[PDB]
Design an enzyme around this catalytic site. Structure first.
Site, PDB file in Angstrom:
ATOM      1  N   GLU A  78     -39.202  -0.831 -41.637  1.00  6.76           N
ATOM      2  CA  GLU A  78     -39.525  -0.109 -40.405  1.00  6.76           C
ATOM      3  C   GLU A  78     -40.633  -0.797 -39.624  1.00  6.76           C
ATOM      4  O   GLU A  78     -40.526  -1.012 -38.416  1.00  6.76           O
ATOM      5  CB  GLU A  78     -39.928   1.330 -40.738  1.00  6.76           C
ATOM      6  CG  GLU A  78     -40.223   2.184 -39.514  1.00  6.76           C
ATOM      7  CD  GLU A  78     -38.992   2.437 -38.662  1.00  6.76           C
ATOM      8  OE1 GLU A  78     -38.035   3.071 -39.157  1.00  6.76           O
ATOM      9  OE2 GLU A  78     -38.982   1.997 -37.493  1.00  6.76           O
ATOM     10  N   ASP A  82     -40.559  -2.249 -35.914  1.00 11.99           N
ATOM     11  CA  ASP A  82     -41.480  -1.742 -34.896  1.00 11.99           C
ATOM     12  C   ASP A  82     -42.282  -2.875 -34.270  1.00 11.99           C
ATOM     13  O   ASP A  82     -42.317  -3.087 -33.061  1.00 11.99           O
ATOM     14  CB  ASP A  82     -42.407  -0.683 -35.495  1.00 11.99           C
ATOM     15  CG  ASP A  82     -41.717   0.514 -36.108  1.00 11.99           C
ATOM     16  OD1 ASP A  82     -40.489   0.692 -35.929  1.00 11.99           O
ATOM     17  OD2 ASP A  82     -42.390   1.323 -36.802  1.00 11.99           O
ATOM     18  N   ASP A 168     -32.070  10.245 -35.779  1.00 13.62           N
ATOM     19  CA  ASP A 168     -30.871   9.478 -36.076  1.00 13.62           C
ATOM     20  C   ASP A 168     -29.796  10.345 -36.717  1.00 13.62           C
ATOM     21  O   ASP A 168     -28.860   9.871 -37.365  1.00 13.62           O
ATOM     22  CB  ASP A 168     -31.210   8.339 -37.031  1.00 13.62           C
ATOM     23  CG  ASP A 168     -32.276   7.372 -36.571  1.00 13.62           C
ATOM     24  OD1 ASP A 168     -32.621   7.212 -35.383  1.00 13.62           O
ATOM     25  OD2 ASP A 168     -32.815   6.699 -37.480  1.00 13.62           O
ATOM     26  N   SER A 285     -35.530   4.501 -34.029  1.00  8.83           N
ATOM     27  CA  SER A 285     -36.637   3.736 -34.587  1.00  8.83           C
ATOM     28  C   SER A 285     -36.758   2.388 -33.883  1.00  8.83           C
ATOM     29  O   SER A 285     -37.814   1.766 -33.838  1.00  8.83           O
ATOM     30  CB  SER A 285     -36.433   3.524 -36.083  1.00  8.83           C
ATOM     31  OG  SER A 285     -36.700   4.687 -36.840  1.00  8.83           O
ATOM     32  N   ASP A 326     -28.341   5.503 -15.795  1.00 10.63           N
ATOM     33  CA  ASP A 326     -27.874   6.828 -16.198  1.00 10.63           C
ATOM     34  C   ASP A 326     -26.738   6.764 -17.210  1.00 10.63           C
ATOM     35  O   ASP A 326     -25.612   6.364 -16.908  1.00 10.63           O
ATOM     36  CB  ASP A 326     -27.456   7.625 -14.954  1.00 10.63           C
ATOM     37  CG  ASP A 326     -27.066   9.064 -15.220  1.00 10.63           C
ATOM     38  OD1 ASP A 326     -27.397   9.613 -16.297  1.00 10.63           O
ATOM     39  OD2 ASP A 326     -26.422   9.660 -14.324  1.00 10.63           O
ATOM     40  N   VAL A 327     -27.021   7.183 -18.443  1.00  8.39           N
ATOM     41  CA  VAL A 327     -25.975   7.228 -19.466  1.00  8.39           C
ATOM     42  C   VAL A 327     -25.022   8.376 -19.138  1.00  8.39           C
ATOM     43  O   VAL A 327     -25.474   9.484 -18.849  1.00  8.39           O
ATOM     44  CB  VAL A 327     -26.549   7.384 -20.878  1.00  8.39           C
ATOM     45  CG1 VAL A 327     -25.455   7.632 -21.910  1.00  8.39           C
ATOM     46  CG2 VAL A 327     -27.340   6.144 -21.266  1.00  8.39           C
ATOM     47  N   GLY A 342     -23.908  13.160 -19.352  1.00  7.27           N
ATOM     48  CA  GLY A 342     -23.358  13.539 -18.058  1.00  7.27           C
ATOM     49  C   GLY A 342     -24.211  12.976 -16.937  1.00  7.27           C
ATOM     50  O   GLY A 342     -25.157  12.218 -17.175  1.00  7.27           O
ATOM     51  N   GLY A 344     -27.022  12.486 -14.405  1.00  3.81           N
ATOM     52  CA  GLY A 344     -28.429  12.820 -14.525  1.00  3.81           C
ATOM     53  C   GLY A 344     -28.870  13.128 -15.946  1.00  3.81           C
ATOM     54  O   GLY A 344     -28.271  12.705 -16.931  1.00  3.81           O
ATOM     55  N   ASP A 346     -29.460  14.357 -19.538  1.00  2.06           N
ATOM     56  CA  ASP A 346     -28.627  15.075 -20.502  1.00  2.06           C
ATOM     57  C   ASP A 346     -29.304  15.143 -21.869  1.00  2.06           C
ATOM     58  O   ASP A 346     -30.273  14.426 -22.119  1.00  2.06           O
ATOM     59  CB  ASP A 346     -27.244  14.445 -20.613  1.00  2.06           C
ATOM     60  CG  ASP A 346     -27.216  12.953 -20.866  1.00  2.06           C
ATOM     61  OD1 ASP A 346     -27.646  12.488 -21.948  1.00  2.06           O
ATOM     62  OD2 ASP A 346     -26.734  12.228 -19.966  1.00  2.06           O
TER      63      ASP A 346
HETATM   64 CA    CA Z   1     -26.975  11.021 -17.986  1.00  5.87          CA
END
Ligand code: CA
EC number: 3.4.21.100
Length: 368
Positions: A78, A82, A168, A285, A326-327, A342, A344, A346
């Site tokens: 980790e 990082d 996760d 992570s 935007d995902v 969606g 914007g 989410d």
């Molecule tokens: Ca989105």
């Protein structure tokens, strides 16, 4: 676009940060559990291989001077992830890298808590990475949530930014850490805190030439144990909504998370030196330290004068969609359950990932 692994040094160009300064004038913190001896060797391997100038590090024993700061073997992976991701994302330099080491001998969650506390009390790291967490309800049950939030509040008030991985386990954080539980959804602590930035995870696609292509939700389904691997997202059952979040209409009066998201799929993950061996690693992570490195550049760009940015993220991005990616495709659940991405903001990804040069310019003109 193509799903593949990436050297940390590529994140500036993927997220539009090459024209910004490095983090050479900003000090960055990382919270760990136990020691980081192998990590520091691995970090030497990383800078040398990439031809970079060596990183000034410090290690700090945050609890009892007789506590256990021995290395945890799985832990080094980790701290590797990082530190290498932060320095790659920062453009290859930070002023100093501080490892705030939690005592492994301490009771309850007291070791971790004291580690958060020392980073805040010293007040020299401007941004601090936290690539860990667990069921907020468990944290609530034993008083850990209450203790730790007091410390994050102090940080925010003093202008420090804590960055925390959202999880996760998708929506299934509290079911045995990720086991499908139908319509039953939960979230991870300390991401659910309003005094920190919560960073979710994406599936990252790149052009042949290595440019950004697109991002979907991180969700790589179940492992051989039956556990889900996906971006944590939802709302806290305990923490009230901070009012800057009120721009996301149609949501409960609770802290919504994550705030923003970056690359997290192992399949499109980071290539990291671990015990001298290169490994391809993902998770939220990873997304958190990418944010920490990018954000450290904007501090360097602004004389480290930028305070806790939550309110500013929400006002600027809601009124300026060009600041983010935007995902829009995926879910963070299983078997038909979970939240869907969606238009914007989410629940799996928040606002999505930041375009750093564009954010940089916004701040130029409007402050942050
Ligand atoms: Ca989105």
């Amino acid at each position: 676009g193509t799903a593949k692994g990436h050297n940390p040094t590529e994140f500036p160009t993927i997220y539009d940060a090459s024209s910004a300064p490095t983090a050479a004038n900003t000090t960055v913190g990382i919270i760990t559990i136990g020691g980081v001896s192998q990590t520091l060797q691995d970090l030497q391997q990383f800078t040398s291989a990439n031809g970079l100038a060596s990183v000034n590090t410090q290690t700090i024993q945050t609890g009892s001077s007789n506590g256990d700061y021995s290395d945890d073997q799985q832990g080094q992976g980790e701290w590797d992830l990082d530190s290498q991701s932060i320095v790659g994302s920062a453009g290859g330099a930070v002023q100093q890298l501080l490892f705030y080491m939690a005592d492994q001998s301490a009771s309850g969650n007291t070791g971790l808590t004291q580690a958060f506390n020392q980073a805040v009390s010293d007040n020299v790291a401007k941004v601090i990475n936290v690539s860990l967490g667990w069921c907020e309800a468990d944290a609530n049950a034993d008083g850990t949530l209450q203790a730790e939030d007091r410390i994050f509040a102090t940080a925010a008030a003093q202008g420090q930014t804590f960055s925390v991985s959202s999880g996760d386990e998708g929506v299934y954080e509290c079911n045995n850490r990720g086991y499908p539980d139908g319509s039953t959804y939960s979230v991870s602590w300390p991401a659910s805190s309003p005094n920190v930035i919560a960073v979710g995870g994406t599936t990252l696609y790149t052009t042949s030439a290595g440019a950004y292509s697109n991002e979907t939700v991180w969700n790589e389904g179940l492992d051989s144990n039956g556990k889900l691997w996906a971006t944590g997202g939802g709302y806290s059952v305990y923490e009230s909504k901070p009012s800057w979040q009120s721009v996301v209409s149609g949501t409960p009066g609770r802290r919504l998370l994550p705030d923003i998201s970056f690359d997290a799929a192992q399949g499109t993950g980071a290539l990291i030196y671990n015990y001298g061996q290169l490994q391809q690693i993902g998770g939220t992570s990873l997304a958190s330290p990418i944010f920490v490195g990018l954000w450290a550049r904007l501090q360097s760009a602004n004389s480290n004068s930028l305070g806790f940015p939550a309110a500013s993220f929400y006002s600027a991005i809601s009124s300026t969609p060009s600041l983010v990616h935007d995902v829009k495709s995926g879910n963070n659940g299983y078997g038909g359950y979970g939240y869907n991405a969606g238009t914007g903001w989410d629940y799996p990804t928040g606002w999505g990932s930041l375009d750093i040069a564009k954010l940089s310019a916004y701040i130029r003109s409007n402050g942050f």
